[PDB]
Amino acid sequence: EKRLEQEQRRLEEARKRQEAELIKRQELIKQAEEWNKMDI
Amino acid sequence: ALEDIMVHYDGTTRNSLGDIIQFLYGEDGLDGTQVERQTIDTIPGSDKAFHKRYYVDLMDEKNSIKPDVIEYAADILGDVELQKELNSEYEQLVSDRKFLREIVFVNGDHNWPLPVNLRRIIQNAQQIFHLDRAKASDLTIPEIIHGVRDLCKKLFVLRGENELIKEAQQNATSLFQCLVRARLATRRILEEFRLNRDAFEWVLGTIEAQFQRSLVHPGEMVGVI
Amino acid sequence: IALDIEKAKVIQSSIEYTTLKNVTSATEIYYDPDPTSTVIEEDFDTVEAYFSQSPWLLRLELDRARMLDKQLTMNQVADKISEVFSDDLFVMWSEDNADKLIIRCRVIEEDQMLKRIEAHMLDLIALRGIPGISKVYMVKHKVSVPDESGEYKNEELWALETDGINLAEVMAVPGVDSSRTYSNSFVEILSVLGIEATRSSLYKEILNVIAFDGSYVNYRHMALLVDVMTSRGYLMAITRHGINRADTGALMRCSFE
Amino acid sequence: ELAILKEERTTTPYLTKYERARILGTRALQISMNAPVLVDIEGETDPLQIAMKELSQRKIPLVIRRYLPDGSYEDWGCDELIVD
Amino acid sequence: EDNNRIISRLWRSFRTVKEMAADRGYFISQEEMDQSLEEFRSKICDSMGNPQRKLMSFLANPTPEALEKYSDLGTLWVEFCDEPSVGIKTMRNFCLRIQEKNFSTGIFIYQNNITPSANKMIPTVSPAIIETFQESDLVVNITHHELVPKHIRLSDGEKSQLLQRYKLKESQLPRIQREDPVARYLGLKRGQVVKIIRRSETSGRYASYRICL
DNA sequence: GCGTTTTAACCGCCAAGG
DNA sequence: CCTTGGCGGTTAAAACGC
């Protein structure tokens, strides 16, 4: 059970990191879409 | 084309310009005359056979070490720290099986030339120490585990405390360590070979010495060979 | 696809190079001044049914047997000709139910020009398949794969072996395991997959040559040889043009050749 | 500068077969040229045999200098190299 | 029909480019990595199904791990070119776009071929780096081949540690060409070292090093 | 004299033969 | 393998419309 708890903690940490990186990524996606619209 | 290539004192294989051809001769640093066809025992067989051969359970009585082969069979069942050690050994064995079966030898071939013949060493020990008879061994499980674990760290191909040197040294003996751990498992030692203590230290010392003797000698003109 | 013969045959047909010359049985040139009719009575029915520029008629008869064998369509051949020649040639093709599969063409002193165009047509009209792959064979391979119980059991699978090499194009064909396509010409392997793949392929070829007659040579020797041949980033041939083009001493180099 | 300190010597601690052969040859030649012998000779007369007897007892007064590819070297005494 | 196969090949090239950008250290969202073919047709293909290469251009920034390990990793701009043949004008305007938006690295994927004049102005785009790939050779990801081991670019500190450990000079390492397909996949610049961990039948695992040219 | 275009010398790339 | 001659081509510049 101790091992399972540690595994769950690490999984939650990884999930938080992925969420933060996705939040950062969406800004770049928006900028790219705006610039591609500008080129058109 | 290959005349000016020679094994140097740091293990690398270089030409006359000093350019590196290989970072370790033969990728293991061994001599061509000091290898023999051996079978790695963790590769073949079904999962059930592997589990039956290598797993040791100290909680279930009928899935434990037989009591007639060990003197201390009374105070073994129910121990949890020794079970932790056995579980670590079995996890190492499973990792070795996965590494050999999924990366190195995908087609499952298990007969490969490797240094120091282990079968010959074991039967020499059995003949030397008269390991016949139904006598019970006095070799405790922690001694087996720690002895094999320490042996797998004294197979020096490269000397030095550098971190990159340590990584190369660990890489150079992966297959051989897999072989050694496949042969010198706890269940196999206690049941199949029935070694006692003195035979066990003799086997460990002999393995280490023969491995040291099987390395390549600096100054080999391996290109011409 | 590996375990199904029908899909494997489909892939084999899709890969093999096939040109118009492969299926063409004979070619002919006729004089016919009426674009809306013809002089030949045999082809008169088909052309009149179709109808319901230069007078020089260029026709050619396709072998029905091989045309069927290559699984081709007269419409496909006509479309290929139209694509390669745009609208410079008016093309009519007989139906599949005709006694002889024929296709007619017309240009929209030209006899020599027509002959040259016919030669070009027989030359470089590509119907389908990867260029450079002359022949393809179906081969059964025995592979040992762990079972659901961990036991190793033999297994038979279908694979293709070709004549001629085009690694980059064949690797891109859908239905092909692009992560395992292999070639016996390591120059192309170097041009496609890099230098480490070239090292592995070179070792495999050398071992194949040595071990054919049952002989055995230790691994480290061939490893040293193929590490020498590929240590400069490119294939260094074992000749004077490979060895003598190094930075080694002049006295050492002059002793060879 | 080029010499490597005794504490940081990283070459093998064993006498390679080439080093053994060269050491035996040099010692045999020196004995044949009336060099002092550092071991007691029972009844031996062959210089090579005397050299082998000296080597077995770690009494050869020679030093091996192992040249690394970059030009640096390690000095090992024949009395501290392990011989099989 | 042929439109379907063209779209499929374009989708495969897009997936390969995204994988390459991920390998070089930049961050690509997991949802974008698994962006399937039907979604690609929905987003790119028009009413007649024709694709626009201009809608596939994207941007990426290095992950914190890659940024920490490699301090020279900037922003990456990947653009597909509509023109089947690229000339001096198109390369010049791409260079202008890179310079005005101060991108560290720009990848320019063309369709058929690139004129030599356009090749001439690639080295003069400093300090930004412009790398060009053809569409045909990106359909298959070569680094997923069986024969191709894993190449990892070494940082400057690791390269220094390597040269000190072996007491080497840069000319004494095994070499890898700059036009080598894996070298172009990793965007190797002259003087950089890749570590290759390789299967070995004598020791299991063997790590080799090569230096670019 | 601004927007545009043609031939032009010029340029490099490539195939063939010694 | 190398030189050789030639091929092709793009891009530029002189010239045009207008």
UniProtKB/TrEMBL annotation, chain A:
Coiled-coil segments on the chain, per record: 1-31
Superkingdom per UniProt: Eukaryota
Name this protein carries in UniProt: Component of the Paf1p complex
Organism lineage string: Eukaryota, Fungi, Dikarya, Ascomycota, Saccharomycotina
UniProtKB/TrEMBL annotation, chain C:
Compartments reported by the entry: Nucleus
Function summary: DNA-dependent RNA polymerase catalyzes the transcription of DNA into RNA using the four ribonucleoside triphosphates as substrates.
Similarity annotation: Belongs to the RNA polymerase beta' chain family.
Name of the protein in its database record: DNA-directed RNA polymerase subunit
Native organism: Komagataella phaffii (strain GS115 / ATCC 20864)
Lineage: Eukaryota, Fungi, Dikarya, Ascomycota, Saccharomycotina
From TrEMBL, chain D:
Keywords: DNA-directed RNA polymerase, Nucleus, Phosphoprotein, Transcription
Origin: domain of life: Eukaryota
Primary localisation category: nucleus
Subcellular location: Nucleus
Coiled-coil ranges from the UniProt annotation: none
GO molecular function, one term: DNA binding
Keyword Transcription recorded: yes
GO-annotated cellular components: RNA polymerase I complex; RNA polymerase II, core complex; RNA polymerase III complex
GO biological process, one term: transcription elongation by RNA polymerase I
UniProt similarity note: Belongs to the archaeal Rpo6/eukaryotic RPB6 RNA polymerase subunit family.
Protein name: DNA-directed RNA polymerases I, II, and III subunit RPABC2
Lineage, top ranks: Eukaryota, Fungi, Dikarya, Ascomycota, Saccharomycotina
UniProtKB/TrEMBL annotation, chain E:
Compartments reported by the entry: Nucleus
Name by which UniProt lists this protein: DNA-directed RNA polymerases I, II, and III subunit RPABC1
Domain RNA polymerase subunit H/Rpb5 C-terminal: 140-212
Family per similarity comment: Belongs to the archaeal Rpo5/eukaryotic RPB5 RNA polymerase subunit family.
NCBIfam families: PRK09570.1 (NF007129)
Record's keyword annotation contains Ion transport: no
Keywords, comma-separated and alphabetical: Nucleus, Transcription
Gene Ontology molecular function: any one: DNA-directed RNA polymerase activity
One BP term from GO: tRNA transcription by RNA polymerase III
Listed InterPro entries: Arch_Rpo5/euc_Rpb5, RNA_pol_Rpb5_N, RNA_pol_Rpb5_N_sf, RNA_pol_subH/Rpb5_C, RNA_pol_subH/Rpb5_CS, RPB5-like_sf
Residue spans crossing the bilayer: none
A cellular component term, taken from the record's GO annotations: RNA polymerase III complex
Taxonomic placement: Eukaryota, Fungi, Dikarya, Ascomycota, Saccharomycotina
Parts forming coiled coils: none
Domain of life: Eukaryota
Main location: nucleus
Pfam families in the cross-refs: RNA_pol_Rpb5_C, RNA_pol_Rpb5_N
RNA polymerase Rpb5 N-terminal domain residues: 6-97
